[PDB]
């Protein structure tokens, strides 16, 4: 029905990790036709291992494959930050079909704490002319990926019209998130100054904007 892989495998730099792929006697346990793919966010998969243990040209010997019973394994030695990706096994089925595994998300720990850079934009005059108002709070270059976002209108909170993304890793291996506060031009012009305050590791960075 599907190839069972652990959902998550975490590791530290320089360490070795093993990703298991368990099937049945009619797929993984039945044939030496098991392949492994590495997939980075927003990118196409890449063939790492084929026929259980064979590595294609250009693929590091840090990647190795093995099989025992109904279980196939991918070992990554000397863990590097660039090994952080999604990994999939696949096998031929007795049904003549093709089946990929459930996928394992590999996360490589150890990178230093990074405080977020906060950029707050008020609504644009073009948007206000369209009888809409959006305050944009952009949060980038942080680690770990956990942030708290609070919105304030010259004191007291703002719960209504708030929409925040889930922190995501960017090309620099640091997290980025965005928070939008939706207002009416009347609400925006009524208050003295609005504030975006992001909390990361107990330390709160605050940016403030005003109708000026």
């Amino acid at each position: 029905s599907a190839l069972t892989q652990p959902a998550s495998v975490s590791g530290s730099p320089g360490q070795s990790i093993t990703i298991s792929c368990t099937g049945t006697s009619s797929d993984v346990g039945g044939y030496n036709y098991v392949s492994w793919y590495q997939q980075h966010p927003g990118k196409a998969p890449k063939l790492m291992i084929y026929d259980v243990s064979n590595r294609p040209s250009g693929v590091s010997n840090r990647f190795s494959g093995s099989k025992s019973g109904n279980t196939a394994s991918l070992t990554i030695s000397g863990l590097q930050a660039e090994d952080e990706a999604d990994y999939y096994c696949s096998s031929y089925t007795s049904s003549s079909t093709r089946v990929f595994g459930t996928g394992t998300k590999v996360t490589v720990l150890g990178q230093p704490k990074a405080n977020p850079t906060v950029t707050l934009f008020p609504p644009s005059s073009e948007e206000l002319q369209a009888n809409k108002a959006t305050l944009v709070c952009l949060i980038s270059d942080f680690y770990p990926g956990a942030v708290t976002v609070a919105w304030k209108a010259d004191g007291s909170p703002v719960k209504a019209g708030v929409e925040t993304t889930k922190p995501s890793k960017q090309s620099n291996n640091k997290y980025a998130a965005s928070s939008y506060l939706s207002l009416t031009p009347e609400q925006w012009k009524s208050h003295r100054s609005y504030s975006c305050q992001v909390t990361h590791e107990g330390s709160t960075v605050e940016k403030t904007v005003a109708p000026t």
Partner: protein, 221 residues
């Protein structure tokens, strides 16, 4: 060298249809097994269908049997996927895959994929707003300026700066999925404050599902 270029993807209503194409080059197309693999957003890889070199032997995932048809035109070096009676669940990136000679399932080359969205919601082109650098920027060192790409559907939007000539200091943030079902995104460039009077900054927003190509000039104030 080896090229696998998909086309034909897009937004379609449930019960609708689409024909995907994969243009191949750099190899003897006719001697390879070809495959389609899909990936629903944030989900795993899923085999769809396979086609043997001559095009006589085909295979299908039970999930697409009776609705999808794989075909190839060896003379025109093209792989096809006719997809009928599409449903929300068929929403995925569709990859064209080349099977390694001497294997039946091992993919040596994958395409970049074509995104297929099945939804009862219609395309919405974005409203693009300039995000002018802070009033006291040229009174400092660095300036952050941007473009707010509001209320579009479906994903993606690509944002470039100065027709692609400005790539350094550019950060296009992932989109927020609002309660409304519409996305919003922001792209920012970090530039020298001193260049704000000298340099013109334009963001090039492309949202292919709605055929939107917007160039927004971002002026200081």
């Amino acid at each position: 060298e080896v090229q696998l270029l998909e086309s034909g993807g897009g937004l379609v209503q449930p019960g609708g249809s689409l024909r995907l194409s994969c243009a191949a080059s750099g190899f003897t197309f006719s001697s390879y097994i070809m495959m389609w693999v899909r990936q629903a957003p944030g989900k795993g890889l899923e085999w769809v269908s396979s086609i043997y070199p001559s095009g006589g032997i085909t295979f299908y995932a039970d999930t697409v049997k009776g609705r999808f048809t794989i075909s190839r035109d060896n003379s025109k070096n093209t792989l096809y996927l006719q997809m009928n009676s599409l449903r929300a669940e068929d929403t995925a990136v569709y990859y064209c895959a080349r099977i390694k000679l001497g294997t039946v399932t091992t993919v040596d080359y994958w395409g970049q994929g074509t995104l297929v969205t099945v939804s009862s919601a219609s395309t919405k082109g974005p409203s693009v707003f300039p995000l002018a650098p802070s009033s006291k920027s040229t009174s400092g060192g660095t300036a952050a300026l941007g473009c707010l790409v509001k209320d579009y559907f479906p994903e993606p939007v690509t944002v470039s700066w100065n027709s692609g000539a400005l790539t350094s200091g550019v950060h296009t943030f992932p989109a927020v999925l609002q309660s409304s079902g519409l996305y919003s995104l922001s792209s920012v460039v970090t530039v020298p404050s001193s260049s704000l009077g000298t340099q013109t900054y334009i963001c090039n927003v492309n949202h292919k599902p709605s055929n939107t190509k917007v160039d927004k000039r971002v002026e200081p104030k």
